Ligand binder design. Sequence first.
Ligand SMILES: [Cl-]
Ligand SMILES: [Cl-]
Ligand SMILES: [Cl-]
Length: 142
Amino acid sequence: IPDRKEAVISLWPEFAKAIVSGKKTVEFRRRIPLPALSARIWIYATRPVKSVIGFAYLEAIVQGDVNTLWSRYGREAFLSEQQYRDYFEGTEKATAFLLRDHQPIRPINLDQLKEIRANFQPPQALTWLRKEETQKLVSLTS
Ligand SMILES: [Cl-]
Ligand SMILES: [Cl-]
Ligand SMILES: [Cl-]
């Protein structure tokens, strides 16, 4: 049973790159199941990259009102007010993940990930990694 110190998240490639390059230090999600505070977040870029391209660490978790969060962290989130607004339409509470110590790596493609976890689907929210899985992911890291 995973302890949520190791997790994977899915982003579109432009946002995934902004993160592994240290540009985007905030990720907004709805109220989803939470990682551990001290977690490594491995960053999975969707099509056409279809790879894990780095990781980053979680310096803080913020939940609160949608307007407040944009006002406070929206610039660090690298998306536009419109995108944020369309996404959080229909809810009043958001989650902000504050990120630090980003690390670009060379891409671990989707085939290698199904080699580590047989039925890997790219996470709609976060997926927690097993111990055995983390070791393999790390082994491929470069
Ligand atoms: Cl959701
Ligand atoms: Cl709500
Ligand atoms: Cl709620």
